[PDB]
Design a protein around this ligand. Structure first.
Ligand SMILES: O=[N+]([O-])c1ccc(I)c([N+](=O)[O-])c1
Ligand SMILES: [Cl-]
Length: 231
């Protein structure tokens, strides 16, 4: 049976408008009056961030805030603005202020929490991640919160999933994982026996649906999938 349901909250349950707005507001704060379009800075930042994380996939953990501060230092040198002090404080303030959940998230977590172990699996530094979950109001809706900082390795390394399952006290066969990127999922959770649910809200990832056991566009479909797996 399924006894645990795991999500990637800060990575996949934040609205698309909300995540972009947090990031844009960080760039605007960093730039101040400097004559660079913040949207252009954001685009360049995401490019360099994706590159930097790909270099760390599967590797031993290094604070993500340190990685992103390195990226911002390269951007400051590139465009000529002064490197912002306290970037991680700016970012946490903007996340707490403008972060936004998909509308069905609170309902879904509450509906599951009574009957399953509801867990979060996050590739974030634990302290800002947990503060962000607190600001969003869902921290205490989770039975467990597990991070790459706790596990010691970046995905697709399986240690983070091994730890999340240990916290729930079950083997992977008893657990579902809801994500939006199936490759860092498959490279880890598949070998542990977990059932994978891909969240594809706009149907934009059809070429990866074969890498997932179930595909949904609304998180309220998750309870129906698990309730039925449990007959
Ligand atoms: O998303 N961002 O734009 C962003 C940039 C830099 C940092 I150090 C963070 N942070 O604190 O995680 C976030
Ligand atoms: Cl982080």
């Amino acid at each position: 049976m399924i006894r645990a349901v795991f999500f990637d909250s800060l990575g996949t349950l934040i609205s698309v408008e909300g995540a972009y707005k947090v990031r844009l507001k960080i760039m605007e704060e960093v730039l101040g009056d400097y004559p660079l379009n913040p949207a252009t800075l954001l685009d360049e930042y995401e490019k360099l961030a994706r590159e930097a994380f790909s270099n760390y996939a599967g590797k031993p953990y290094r604070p993500m805030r340190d990685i992103l501060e390195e990226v911002m230092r390269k951007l400051a040198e590139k465009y000529g603005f002064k490197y912002p002090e306290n970037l991680r404080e700016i970012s946490l303030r903007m996340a707490c202020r403008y972060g936004e959940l998909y509308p069905e998230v609170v309902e879904v977590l509450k509906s599951l929490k009574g009957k399953y172990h509801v867990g979060d699996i996050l590739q974030r530094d634990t302290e800002p991640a947990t503060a962000f979950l607190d600001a969003l109001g869902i921290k205490d809706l989770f039975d467990s919160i597990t991070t790459s900082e706790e596990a010691g390795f970046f995905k697709p390394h399986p240690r983070i999933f091994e730890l999340a399952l240990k916290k729930a006290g079950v083997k992977g066969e008893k657990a579902v994982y809801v994500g939006d990127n199936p490759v860092k999922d498959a490279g880890g959770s598949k070998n542990l026996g977990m059932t994978s649910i891909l969240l594809d809200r706009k149907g934009e990832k059809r070429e990866f649906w074969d890498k997932a056991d179930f595909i949904v566009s609304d998180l309220r479909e998750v309870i129906k999938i698990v309730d039925e797996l449990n007959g």
